[PDB]
Scaffold this motif. Structure first.
Motif, mmCIF file in Angstrom:
data_model
loop_
_atom_site.group_PDB
_atom_site.id
_atom_site.type_symbol
_atom_site.label_atom_id
_atom_site.label_comp_id
_atom_site.label_asym_id
_atom_site.label_seq_id
_atom_site.Cartn_x
_atom_site.Cartn_y
_atom_site.Cartn_z
ATOM 1 N N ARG A 263 0.853 -1.185 0.000
ATOM 2 C CA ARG A 263 0.000 0.000 0.000
ATOM 3 C C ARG A 263 0.889 1.235 0.000
ATOM 4 O O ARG A 263 1.246 1.769 1.061
ATOM 5 C CB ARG A 263 -0.963 -0.023 1.181
ATOM 6 C CG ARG A 263 -1.831 -1.272 1.172
ATOM 7 C CD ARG A 263 -2.617 -1.422 2.443
ATOM 8 N NE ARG A 263 -2.163 -2.538 3.274
ATOM 9 C CZ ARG A 263 -1.519 -2.394 4.431
ATOM 10 N NH1 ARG A 263 -1.235 -1.179 4.891
ATOM 11 N NH2 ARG A 263 -1.152 -3.459 5.127
ATOM 12 N N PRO A 264 1.278 1.703 -1.181
ATOM 13 C CA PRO A 264 2.071 2.933 -1.278
ATOM 14 C C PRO A 264 1.348 4.103 -0.630
ATOM 15 O O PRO A 264 0.169 4.349 -0.888
ATOM 16 C CB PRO A 264 2.221 3.140 -2.793
ATOM 17 C CG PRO A 264 1.848 1.831 -3.421
ATOM 18 C CD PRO A 264 0.866 1.190 -2.499
ATOM 19 N N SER A 265 2.067 4.835 0.200
ATOM 20 C CA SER A 265 1.505 5.967 0.928
ATOM 21 C C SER A 265 2.152 7.254 0.414
ATOM 22 O O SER A 265 3.277 7.593 0.793
ATOM 23 C CB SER A 265 1.708 5.789 2.431
ATOM 24 O OG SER A 265 1.349 6.963 3.147
ATOM 25 N N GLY A 266 1.448 7.964 -0.457
ATOM 26 C CA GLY A 266 1.917 9.239 -0.954
ATOM 27 C C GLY A 266 2.568 9.197 -2.313
ATOM 28 O O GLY A 266 3.122 10.215 -2.742
ATOM 29 N N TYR A 267 2.520 8.060 -3.001
ATOM 30 C CA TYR A 267 3.087 7.925 -4.335
ATOM 31 C C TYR A 267 2.374 6.761 -5.006
ATOM 32 O O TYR A 267 1.536 6.092 -4.399
ATOM 33 C CB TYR A 267 4.608 7.728 -4.278
ATOM 34 C CG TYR A 267 5.020 6.530 -3.467
ATOM 35 C CD1 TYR A 267 5.070 6.591 -2.081
ATOM 36 C CD2 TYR A 267 5.325 5.326 -4.081
ATOM 37 C CE1 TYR A 267 5.424 5.492 -1.329
ATOM 38 C CE2 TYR A 267 5.682 4.213 -3.331
ATOM 39 C CZ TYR A 267 5.724 4.306 -1.954
ATOM 40 O OH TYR A 267 6.080 3.212 -1.189
ATOM 41 N N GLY A 268 2.718 6.511 -6.263
ATOM 42 C CA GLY A 268 1.928 5.591 -7.058
ATOM 43 C C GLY A 268 2.158 4.126 -6.776
ATOM 44 O O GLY A 268 1.206 3.365 -6.583
ATOM 45 N N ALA A 269 3.420 3.713 -6.761
ATOM 46 C CA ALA A 269 3.789 2.315 -6.609
ATOM 47 C C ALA A 269 5.276 2.277 -6.308
ATOM 48 O O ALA A 269 6.009 3.212 -6.641
ATOM 49 C CB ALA A 269 3.468 1.499 -7.871
ATOM 50 N N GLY A 270 5.711 1.196 -5.664
ATOM 51 C CA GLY A 270 7.111 1.087 -5.315
ATOM 52 C C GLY A 270 7.622 -0.335 -5.272
ATOM 53 O O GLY A 270 6.883 -1.263 -4.926
ATOM 54 N N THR A 271 8.872 -0.521 -5.669
ATOM 55 C CA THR A 271 9.591 -1.770 -5.476
ATOM 56 C C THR A 271 10.777 -1.454 -4.586
ATOM 57 O O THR A 271 11.492 -0.477 -4.830
ATOM 58 C CB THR A 271 10.067 -2.366 -6.805
ATOM 59 O OG1 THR A 271 8.976 -2.404 -7.729
ATOM 60 C CG2 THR A 271 10.634 -3.784 -6.614
ATOM 61 N N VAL A 272 10.962 -2.253 -3.542
ATOM 62 C CA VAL A 272 12.069 -2.096 -2.611
ATOM 63 C C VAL A 272 13.066 -3.211 -2.887
ATOM 64 O O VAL A 272 12.681 -4.383 -2.978
ATOM 65 C CB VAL A 272 11.583 -2.132 -1.152
ATOM 66 C CG1 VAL A 272 12.775 -2.275 -0.188
ATOM 67 C CG2 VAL A 272 10.757 -0.910 -0.833
ATOM 68 N N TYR A 273 14.338 -2.852 -3.036
ATOM 69 C CA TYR A 273 15.425 -3.819 -3.164
ATOM 70 C C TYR A 273 16.315 -3.734 -1.930
ATOM 71 O O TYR A 273 16.606 -2.633 -1.451
ATOM 72 C CB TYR A 273 16.255 -3.545 -4.418
ATOM 73 C CG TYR A 273 15.467 -3.540 -5.706
ATOM 74 C CD1 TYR A 273 14.758 -2.404 -6.116
ATOM 75 C CD2 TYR A 273 15.438 -4.661 -6.523
ATOM 76 C CE1 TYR A 273 14.034 -2.394 -7.302
ATOM 77 C CE2 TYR A 273 14.719 -4.661 -7.722
ATOM 78 C CZ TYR A 273 14.020 -3.522 -8.098
ATOM 79 O OH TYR A 273 13.313 -3.516 -9.275
#
Length: 262
Positions: free
Chosen positions: A31-41
């Motif tokens: 659930r991205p909070s404040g932006y569209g989408a994210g991938t964490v490495y």
């Protein structure tokens, strides 16, 4: 002893390889909070908590354009979040807000026991990167948040090129033949406006606007410089002083400038 130094001593060869010493895993942010989408490495067993870097693509672009930075940086000991913006048409000030929000969510995940990066991040040590308007947004992040430890925008574009207030160590990747964000009216005036910080300007010979995006032909050099810069300034790691500050003396570089980088 430097409490932030991580991993084995660097060589040109280890920095030019497609991956560093650490094993990289990734996950999509639920659930991205404040932006569209994210991938964490993130790396496994880096030997301590590591800094976090948020990377933002350009106008009309998505994570695919900047995705290669994720595994490249994380394999040397960083947690990296690549984001999509709320809209691909977002401008640099909005990209900056979303970049800082992504960093804030990485901090939250670091405090969340169910998260893979639980306890892996030093939330006091953050950096910003991004392409084009996302690179403009990184400079705006740095101007507005001088607690950031480093910035490395690529082919940056912003409406105003006056970043004279920036005190963050800033590496600007530029593309010599950029016809979108021309070096002479974007990347170079931006670089020229900063007199308070460690900074560097690295122009890719014959490069178009996308010369530092995923799949570019200069990943060995661009990746070496990005990792070295982030290690040197996010970790204060003087083992990287030469790699971070040196002229690469390379036919792939058409213009090199640096200041306050010993």
């Amino acid at each position: 002893t430097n409490p932030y130094a991580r991993g084995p001593n660097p060589t040109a060869a280890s920095l030019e390889a497609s991956a560093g010493p650490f094993t990289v895993r990734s996950f999509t942010v639920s659930r991205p909070s404040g932006y569209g989408a994210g991938t964490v490495y993130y790396p496994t067993n880096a030997g301590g908590t590591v800094g976090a870097i948020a990377i933002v693509p350009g106008y009309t672009a998505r994570q695919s354009s900047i995705k290669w930075w994720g595994p490249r940086l994380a394999s040397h000991g960083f947690v990296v979040i690549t984001i999509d913006t709320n809209s691909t048409l977002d401008q640099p000030p909005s990209r900056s807000s979303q970049q800082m929000a992504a960093l804030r969510q990485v901090a939250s995940l670091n405090g969340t026991s169910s998260s893979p990066i639980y306890g892996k991040v030093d939330t006091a040590r953050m950096g910003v990167m991004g392409w084009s308007m996302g690179g403009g947004g990184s400079l705006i992040s740095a101007a507005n948040n001088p607690s950031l430890k480093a910035a490395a925008p690529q082919a940056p574009w912003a409406s105003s090129t006056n970043f004279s207030s920036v005190t963050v160590p800033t590496l600007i990747f530029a593309c010599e033949n950029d016809s979108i964000a021309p070096v002479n009216s974007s990347a170079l005036p931006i670089y020229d406006s900063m007199s308070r910080n460690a900074k560097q300007f690295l122009e890719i010979n014959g490069g178009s606007h996308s010369c530092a995006n995923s799949g570019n032909s200069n990943q060995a050099l661009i990746g070496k410089k990005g990792v070295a810069w982030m290690k040197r300034f996010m970790d204060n790691d003087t083992r990287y002083s030469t790699f971070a500050c040196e002229n690469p003396n390379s036919t792939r570089v058409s213009d090199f400038r640096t200041a306050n980088c010993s």
